[PDB]
């Protein structure tokens, strides 16, 4: 029973770290969307200009 | 960088192996990894925001459209506005998670010391060379309850007794 | 190994990623991986290397010689990758 208990003890603290970290990462991808639109506009502009 | 978050993530993934509670939790981490890996290659792919008005305008000899698209790009240079939506959901999630985490932590910490104490109790107290059934009747009224229930039932062979203790007979 | 050494047409692959990919097959880490998944593994290993330790990759590229310490780090990295 002590063996079972020891696993759970360590988990309880450390999991909270991952919990935060995971959402933090997701936030970064939101910001990446703003980038994506910047990238997009540049690509489009270069293409129209290339045709000219 | 992003790799710090992810180094803790994958260390935690191979720790998450050691929790069988996961179902789609590992799939959520996998998903955050996917799009995280997408944004870094997006960011590495990135074109310079505007066309070169130095080189790439002086190439064109039809130029009256390079000023148009130069100014149009630099006008609409914000191409998307910011999103911070993780400040309402992350705190809510963090509250339930924190509560549950702390509950688990305190519960198992208590249990560890309870088991430690119980382990000590078996070592430091155990009559077993002179144990009296009176002491067991005192430690559990289950003893008398079962004896009485057996007399009431009218079975004077208690099953299991001879399956881990002997018995003898002449017949 | 034979499955591993295929390369998609008209795309080259940097030397700094040749040394890791080949390392896995050589050390037999990918022996366990089934043939159909070898291809998927290859691309995954590269992304995994880029995320987990692009320090390792950069060291491999620039030092250009694999010291025992670098091979040590690599063994670990492959172990981690294969496990996932």
Biggest CA-to-CA distance, chain A: 76
Whether chain A has a CB inside 8 Å of the CB on B88: the answer is no
Q: Please check whether residue B2 lies inside any domain of the structure.
A: no
Last residue of a domain, one of B60, B85, B111: B111
The Cα of B44 is separated from the nearest Cα of chain C by a number of Å equal to 12
Query: What burial letters (b/e) apply to B16-31, b meaning 16+ CB within 10 Å?
Result: beeeeeeeebeeebee
Distance in angstroms (rounded) separating the CA atoms of residues C69 and A27: 36
Q: Which two tokens stand for residue C38?
A: 């070898």
Among B111, B143, B160, identify where a domain stops. B111
Does B58 share its domain with B138?
Answer: no
CB-defined contacts B:C, below 8 A: 21
Query: Which of B95, B111, B127 is a domain's end point?
Result: B111
The C-alpha atoms of residue B149 and residue B139 are separated, in whole angstroms, by 18
Residue C83 is nearest to which of B14, B37, B40, comparing CB atoms? B14
Residue B3 lies in a domain: no
Distance CA(B171)–CA(B168), nearest Å, equals 9
C and B in touch (3+ CB pairs within 8 angstroms): yes
Same domain, B14 and B50: yes
CB B80 within 8 A of CB A34: yes
Q: At what angle do helices B2-16 and B25-45 cross, to 10 degrees?
A: 160
Contact, B150 vs A44, CB < 8 A?
no
* Crossing angle (nearest 10°) for helices C15-26 and C68-83: 70
Measured distance CA(C82)–CA(B39) in Å, rounded: 24
Does the CA dihedral B7-B8-B14-B16 come out positive or negative? negative
Query: What is the CATH number assigned to the segment(s) C1-84?
Result: 1.20.150.20
Compute the distance between CA of residue B94 and CA of residue B21 in angstroms, rounded to an integer.
19
What lies within 8 Å, CB to CB, of A26 at 6+ separation is B32, B35, B86
- Whether B156 maps to a domain, the answer reads yes
Q: Under a CB-based contact definition with an 8 Å cutoff, are residues A29 and B35 in contact?
A: yes
User: Token pair of B8, please?
Assistant: 């803790």
Chain B: give the shortest CA distance to residue A14, in Å: 8
Do residues B143 and B94 share a domain?
A: no
Do B93 and B147 share a structural domain?
no
B126 with B162, same domain: the answer is yes
The per-residue DSSP string of B87-139 comes to TTHHHHHHHHHHHHHHHHHHHHHHHHHHHHHHHHHHHH----SS--HHHHHHH
In chain B, positions 53-72, which contact chain A (CB-CB < 8 Å)? 56, 60, 62, 65-66, 69
**B103 and B124 co-located in one domain:** no
Q: Which residue has the tokens 């063994």?
A: C75
Q: B171 by DSSP, 3-state: which?
A: coil
Between B25-45 and C38-52, two packed helices, what is the crossing angle to 10 degrees?
Answer: 70
Contact (CB<8Å) B6/C51:
yes
Q: Resolution limit in angstroms?
A: 3.8
CA angle A43, A47, A50 (to 5 degrees): 140
The token pair at B79 is 């191409």
Q: Choose the closest CB to C47 out of B3, B14, B37.
A: B37
CA distance A48 to B129: 97
Q: How far is CA B127 from CA A35, B121, B124, B165, C72, in A?
A: 75, 12, 10, 19, 56
Distance CA C53, CA C17 (A): 12
Asked if B62 lies within 8 A of A41 by C-beta distance, the reply is no
- The interaxial angle of helices B2-16 and A2-51, nearest 10 deg, is 140
- Same domain? For B124 and B106 the reply is no
Looking at the fold, whether B86 and B165 belong to one and the same domain comes out as: no
Asked if B42 reaches chain A (Cβ–Cβ under 8 Å), the answer is yes
Does any domain span residue B165? yes
User: Structural domain of residue B58, as residue ranges?
Assistant: 8-111
3-state secondary structure of C28: coil
Whole-Å CA distances, B99 to B81, B91, B95, C24: 35, 12, 6, 43
Please say whether the beta carbons of C27 and C76 come within 8 A.
no
Neighboring chain C residues of B36 at a CB cutoff of 8 Å: 51
Residue B161 covered by a domain: yes
B90 and B155 fall within a common domain: no
Nearest CB neighbour to B28, from listed A9, A12, A22: A22
Domain ranges of chain C: 1-84
Residue B1 in any domain: the answer is no
Cβ contact B79–A11 (<8 Å): no
Query: Are B92 and B137 found together in one domain?
Result: no
* B139 and B103 co-located in one domain: no
**Token pair for C11:** 């795309």
Confirm whether B60 is domain-assigned.
yes
b/e C27-47 (16+ beta carbons within 10 angstroms → b): eebbeebeeeebeebbeebbe
DSSP chain C: -TTTT---TT----HHHHHHHHHHHHTTGGGSS-GGGHHHHHHHHHHHHHHH-HHHHHHHHHH-S--HHHHHHHHHHHHHHHH-
Give the list of residues 6+ apart from residue B137 with CB closer than 8 angstroms, or none. B143, B144
- Report DSSP state, residue A36: H
Strands (E), A3-52: none
Distance CA B84, CA C70 (A): 40
**Same-domain check for residues B132 and B66:** no
Q: Using the beta-carbon criterion (under 8 Å), do C52 and B6 form an inter-chain contact?
A: yes
Residues of B in contact with C83 (CB under 8 A): 14
């Amino acid at each position: 029973r002590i063996d079972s208990v020891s696993q759970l003890q360590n988990v309880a603290e450390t999991t909270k770290v991952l919990f935060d970290v995971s959402k933090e990462t997701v936030e970064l991808e939101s910001e990446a969307f703003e980038l994506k639109q910047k990238v997009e506009l540049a690509h489009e502009a270069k293409a129209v200009l290339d045709s000219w | 960088a992003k790799s710090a978050a992810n180094k803790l993530d994958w260390a935690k993934v191979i720790s998450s192996l050691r929790i069988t509670g996961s179902t789609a939790t590992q799939l959520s981490s996998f998903k955050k990894r996917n799009d995280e890996a997408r944004r870094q290659l997006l960011e590495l792919q990135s074109q310079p925001t505007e066309v070169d008005f130095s080189h790439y305008r002086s190439v064109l000899k039809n130029t009256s459209v390079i000023d148009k698209i130069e100014s149009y790009v630099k006008q609409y240079k914000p191409v998307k506005i910011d999103a911070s939506k993780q400040l309402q959901v992350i705190e809510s999630f963090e509250k339930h998670a924190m509560t549950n985490a702390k509950e688990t932590e305190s519960l198992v910490s208590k249990e560890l010391k309870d088991l430690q104490s119980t382990l000590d109790n078996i070592q430091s107290a155990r009559p077993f060379d002179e144990l009296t059934v009176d002491d067991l009747t005192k430690i559990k009224p289950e003893i008398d309850a079962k004896v009485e229930e057996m007399v009431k039932k009218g079975k004077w062979d208690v099953p299991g007794y001879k399956d881990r203790f002997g018995n003898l007979n002449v017949m | 190994l034979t499955q591993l050494l295929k390369q998609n047409q008209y795309s080259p692959l940097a030397t700094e990623e040749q040394v890791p990919l080949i390392y896995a097959g050589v050390n037999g880490h990918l022996d366990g991986i089934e043939l159909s998944r070898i291809g998927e593994f290859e691309s995954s290993f590269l992304s995994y290397l880029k995320s987990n330790h692009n320090e390792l990759l950069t060291e491999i590229r620039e030092k250009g010689e694999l010291s025992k310490e670098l091979l040590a780090s690599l063994k670990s990295a492959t172990e981690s990758f294969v496990a996932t």
